[PDB]
Amino acid sequence: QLKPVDALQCYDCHTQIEDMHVVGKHATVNCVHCHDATEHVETASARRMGERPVTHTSPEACASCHTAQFNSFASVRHESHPREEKANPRSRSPKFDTLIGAHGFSLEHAEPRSHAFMLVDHFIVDRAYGGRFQYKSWQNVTDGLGAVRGAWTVIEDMDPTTSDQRRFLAQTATAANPVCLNCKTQDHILDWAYMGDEHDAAKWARTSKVVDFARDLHHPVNCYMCHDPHSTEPRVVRDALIHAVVDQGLGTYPYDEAKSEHVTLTPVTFQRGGEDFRKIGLLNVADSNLMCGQCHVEYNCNPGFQQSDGAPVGMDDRRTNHFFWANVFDYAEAAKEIDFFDFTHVTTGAPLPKLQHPELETFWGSTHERNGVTCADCHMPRVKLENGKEYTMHSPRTPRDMMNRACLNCHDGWTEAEAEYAIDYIKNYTHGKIMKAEFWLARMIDLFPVAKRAGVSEDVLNEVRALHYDAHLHWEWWTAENSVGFHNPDQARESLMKSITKSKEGVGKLDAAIDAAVA
Amino acid sequence: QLKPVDALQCYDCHTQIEDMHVVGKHATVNCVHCHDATEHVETASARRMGERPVTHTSPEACASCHTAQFNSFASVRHESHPREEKANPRSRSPKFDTLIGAHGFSLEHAEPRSHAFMLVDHFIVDRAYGGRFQYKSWQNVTDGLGAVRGAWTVIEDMDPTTSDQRRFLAQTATAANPVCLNCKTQDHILDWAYMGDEHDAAKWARTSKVVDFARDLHHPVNCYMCHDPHSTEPRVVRDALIHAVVDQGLGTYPYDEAKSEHVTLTPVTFQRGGEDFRKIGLLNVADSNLMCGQCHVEYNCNPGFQQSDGAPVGMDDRRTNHFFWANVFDYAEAAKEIDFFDFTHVTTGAPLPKLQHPELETFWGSTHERNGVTCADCHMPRVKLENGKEYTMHSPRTPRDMMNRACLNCHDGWTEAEAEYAIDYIKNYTHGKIMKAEFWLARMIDLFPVAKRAGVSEDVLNEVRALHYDAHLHWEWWTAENSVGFHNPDQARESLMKSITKSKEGVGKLDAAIDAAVA
């Protein structure tokens, strides 16, 4: 090889970048590391892009100076069970098939594994692209580094000649859409307007042909999702998160006004031909809660339906790219606010929300969050070295693998066995309430066809359908959320007991109605 | 089983015991645990003992209520190399046979092993009783609990019919005498007057037939050596220690007057027929430096000779039970204060001191000692229990076995590997200097016969004999001291460098004199 460009020349038309670049810890880092802009420079004016310069979005673009963080970022935790289906007695949600009915998640919902695989896994999961995309080889499942280097080096398209979403295997679904990708990659960061709105400068939008968009995307969880590449400063880039914090007025910590003042997101808008195009959110502190909260939150990234009239809410509507940014007890109200539900249960006919990994919103208010602990403290701490610069690890994983750093540094009276035991006590307890919430909800769901077939009245079914909304929300939050209660045990406990209460109620109401109908 | 005695009835005559017993943590502990005094009570007067009560001196007498401490006390560290001779390229003093000459230690000087064996190893070492006492079987070498229960359960006497010290094997010596036993056992605590003086009330004294004494003795390092059995309070019982510290006013920390004020021995004297018989030294705090310094010090416990006139100093003289109570740099002067040396080197003719394990006097003034660390902090810490009362371990051993407790609790920036490495750095460095001090001293010694045979003058010989005393002292201190410099690395270094300097001077004078003599 690389030959530096004259950055001062760049600054002549890129004051917004200069202001970020010259002030930060990348002041000495030349644009050529991340951009090829020779023809751009030859052809541009301050008012005309000329040739579009290339922006290198590979995490490997950072590995020439930050190999340690890159290597950690690419690493694979073999102990994290790969491709393990949750609808399964060995996993999170043994009754998930009954509970979720014909939702796309019924086609496959595996447990999470290492970050390196996130784009790949998104592409190949059975629910996403109808089986269109597949590992080139079952051997490829191990290759975290190959995945980081580019999805398409390890997976393949069954039919590169067509772009339509269809099933290639009988038990697959085509739930993927362009919004999904925002939590898998930011390769498209310069090609996607804020919120995924259609925009003249945006190749890709909420309404794009997701198969064509998929083909343009390569790298998982880009290094620049958390670090501004020009200033180095901590940031978020995820549109829905900025929208929640800023546009919705909710603040960084919606349940703590002081903390929302202590931890700040400063939006920065970049323009195209003078029009607002894309945004980022500069953090005043490297708050991993927000960094991780770009993805580990409950969201819409899918069409749905309006609670008011059942009208479809398709990808063209911003509500299909939305963070609720709310705890489990506020979720129903948040969803009601945007007049939105995900799906109608196939058996019971109840409009339902569909819950996805609400780790941040669960973590809010927990003792750990109340005390200033962030996701990275337990999942992504600094390495420990007798004689080394102690950099931050970059592939988040269970604190079980690093108990001294993750727990024992703070809990200095405990042994590693005790700390793990405290984890398991909570997880076990919660999992037991999940099993009971599933038992009861499944009972209620199973009673629906009996009720309908015995001629139970719409009024009664409609009451149960209402209960089903809260029973479902207050169960699924917990199979969706991946800490099995650890992140907020009192909350998991209250919520799951609520789900069970609702479900028992619906069962009693169904039973009474069936017995009456039959009498 | 045991029936409690009427303590009050004892207290009528035993007023000092009452004072100690009723006020401490053994107030509820009946005399019958440690004494069988029925015939005594029936026969005693205010002044005559009458029938002698039995005192149970086994550590096992404490085990009924202090099992944890007893079990730890009896435990055996297998990794402490057993019966390993120091005069050995694999051990402390490869040139020891040259350096110590005809001294008794030349018959055997093994490295220390676990406390449980101390009395047995004293009885059976080749230098002690002419090989009279032997393990009943080589199998018995592992039996630490057996040894604690009584030496004579695991060892035997080659000739119970005679009491004279003589060799039963060709390469043994009969170095033992009754003073030795004070650092192996206190079974004889009621049978030995303070200092081992001949005394009407003492069955055993400095001048006793040691073989007869030996047969009267059973247990190692009795629990009551450090704990008063009546009050439970920390104490010492070793006469020569109390003599140094209290009688001679040298203080518990003779190099630190302020510390000697803060750590104190309060003498308590017990009489027999109204004359002073035995003493203990009650500690104001449980300072294990003083507890351990009952044994881990440099001492006389052997006949020797006067520096002034060469006259023998036999067991009758109190100097044969003496704690020098001096660091390596003050030792020569302390030996002069008692006009004493141990042996004449068989080759050089030099009067020499014989140095034995001066761990405490080495420890004085070390960084750790200065910061109030004690022997037990590194060698006998509390056990660590997740869920138990954490008692003190009671078989002292290398901190290598228990680094978290011994080192890493105070040195929390260090890993176990780092703390060991620091240990090894000092031991290696020190060992290196001991090997060089050996090389030079041996070279000096070996030159003496060449000098003598060349006709070198007594004046030159005498001057090199004076050098030998210090060359020896500043060498042997360190093979005697079992930490290989760790206890005081800067002192070991200065002193070993002094030994070397003296030896090189000695060699230079002998070489010059031999050269002149031959020419």
Ligand code: HEC
């Ligand atoms: C004026 C003569 C320019 C100079 C000198 C440089 N750039 Fe530029 N650049 C310029 C314009 C008018 C635009 C378009 C802004 C808009 O309204 O859209 C750009 C764009 C970029 C981009 C983004 C391209 C994209 O994918 O949207 C990059 C990464 C970029 N420019 C980099 C860049 C570099 C590294 C330069 C020095 C080698 C440089 N530009 C000079 C105008 C001008």
Ligand code: HEC
């Ligand atoms: C890697 C460490 C980078 C270096 C060094 C430089 N740039 Fe950059 N740039 C980088 C990325 C990954 C992106 C995508 C957007 C994001 O925020 O991550 C960009 C973007 C730009 C743009 C477009 C900004 C916009 O209007 O949307 C421009 C104009 C730009 N970069 C210019 C630029 C210049 C001039 C640099 C040398 C001073 C430079 N970049 C260095 C990554 C990296």
Ligand code: HEC
């Ligand atoms: C060398 C040519 C680099 C490239 C390519 C990338 N980074 Fe960098 N980074 C570089 C330097 C010399 C420094 C300063 C280090 C220091 O000691 O001050 C940095 C710093 C960072 C930081 C942290 C700044 C801090 O707060 O300590 C980050 C987060 C960082 N760099 C990120 C990063 C990313 C994401 C990159 C790929 C887009 C990247 N760097 C490339 C040198 C270089």
Ligand code: HEC
């Ligand atoms: C979107 C770009 C994400 C960001 C930002 C963070 N995470 Fe993540 N995480 C994400 C996905 C899509 C997955 C599943 C990946 C797959 O292929 O299955 C994960 C997974 C995890 C895990 C589990 C890893 C394992 O060993 O199973 C953890 C512990 C995790 N994520 C935590 C985490 C932390 C602490 C983050 C901030 C530092 C973070 N994630 C950001 C998506 C994204």
Ligand code: HEC
């Ligand atoms: C950010 C708000 C995300 C959105 C948008 C999408 N996903 Fe996601 N995904 C996210 C996280 C934090 C995780 C790990 C936690 C968990 O429940 O696993 C995931 C995980 C996946 C996985 C791996 C596990 C699995 O379900 O098999 C896949 C295959 C996946 N996600 C696919 C997927 C699809 C198809 C999406 C659009 C409909 C989508 N994700 C969006 C974060 C986010």
Ligand code: HEC
């Ligand atoms: C959000 C999920 C992140 C992603 C994506 C990347 N990094 Fe990171 N990085 C993150 C955190 C929480 C931290 C620690 C910040 C703190 O002050 O506590 C870091 C730190 C760095 C650094 C600084 C040195 C260090 O502590 O290791 C560098 C140079 C860095 N990160 C680089 C980097 C690279 C190269 C990435 C892609 C491989 C990358 N980061 C992604 C959070 C996140």
Ligand code: HEC
């Ligand atoms: C320490 C108090 C933690 C905080 C801070 C965060 N998490 Fe956590 N998480 C924690 C535990 C003990 C567990 C269970 C892990 C185990 O081995 O049993 C988890 C689990 C997760 C997971 C699933 C990981 C896995 O099972 O391998 C994820 C995806 C996760 N946590 C994410 C996450 C987020 C996003 C956080 C900030 C909002 C966060 N965790 C903080 C402990 C702690």
Ligand code: HEC
């Ligand atoms: C007065 C009639 C006494 C009574 C009542 C008890 N004891 Fe005694 N004892 C007495 C004398 C005069 C002596 C000699 C020492 C002295 O204090 O002058 C002793 C000695 C002992 C000893 C030490 C024995 C030894 O081997 O040296 C012990 C252990 C002892 N006594 C115990 C003891 C007990 C337990 C008594 C109540 C059962 C008791 N004594 C009563 C005088 C008298």
Ligand code: HEC
């Ligand atoms: C073990 C826990 C004991 C208890 C209970 C009692 N005694 Fe004791 N005693 C014990 C030992 C090991 C010794 C030897 C000396 C020493 O200080 O360790 C003694 C000594 C005595 C003596 C002799 C004191 C002297 O003049 O030399 C007497 C008189 C004595 N003990 C009395 C005594 C009484 C009356 C007790 C019940 C109240 C008692 N002891 C309990 C061990 C233990």
Ligand code: HEC
């Ligand atoms: C039961 C009949 C016991 C006999 C035999 C021995 N000890 Fe004891 N000891 C006993 C009790 C009930 C207590 C008090 C426990 C408490 O903490 O309240 C003790 C205490 C001690 C102590 C500790 C004093 C302290 O400062 O904490 C010591 C050092 C002690 N005992 C020593 C000891 C010895 C050496 C024994 C054999 C001679 C012995 N004890 C026997 C109960 C009993």
Ligand code: HEC
């Ligand atoms: C206290 C001042 C002691 C006197 C009196 C005696 N010994 Fe000793 N001995 C003492 C300690 C602290 C140690 C461990 C340190 C060491 O140099 O090993 C020992 C060790 C022994 C051993 C075992 C190692 C060995 O030398 O083979 C034996 C066999 C031994 N001691 C015998 C012995 C003899 C024969 C004594 C009178 C001449 C004698 N010891 C006195 C402390 C003390």
Ligand code: HEC
């Ligand atoms: C000196 C070399 C000792 C020998 C001989 C015995 N013990 Fe001990 N003991 C010693 C120390 C340094 C300590 C810790 C004191 C402190 O305050 O830190 C102890 C402690 C005890 C206790 C108290 C409870 C505990 O800490 O474990 C008891 C009950 C005790 N020791 C009993 C005991 C027994 C039964 C012994 C013979 C088996 C014994 N001690 C010998 C030092 C020494």
Ligand code: HEC
């Ligand atoms: C005289 C009764 C002693 C008392 C009081 C203390 N120690 Fe000792 N120790 C003594 C001897 C005679 C020996 C040699 C034993 C043998 O048979 O060889 C020892 C040995 C040790 C050792 C070495 C243990 C090993 O595993 O090799 C250590 C570390 C030691 N001693 C330390 C020590 C401590 C800390 C003491 C006070 C708590 C202590 N000893 C007292 C003799 C005596």
Ligand code: HEC
């Ligand atoms: C911590 C700062 C210590 C203090 C306090 C005491 N000792 Fe020590 N000792 C220490 C070390 C690191 C070593 C070397 C052991 C090793 O494994 O390398 C020793 C050694 C001894 C030994 C020989 C033990 C053996 O090598 O197995 C003895 C007999 C000994 N130390 C005795 C002792 C005494 C009596 C103490 C108080 C005067 C004392 N030590 C304090 C570390 C420390």
Ligand SMILES: O=S([O-])[O-]
């Ligand atoms: O599909 S993702 O949100 O788990």
Ligand SMILES: O=S([O-])[O-]
């Ligand atoms: O001989 S003793 O002092 O080891």
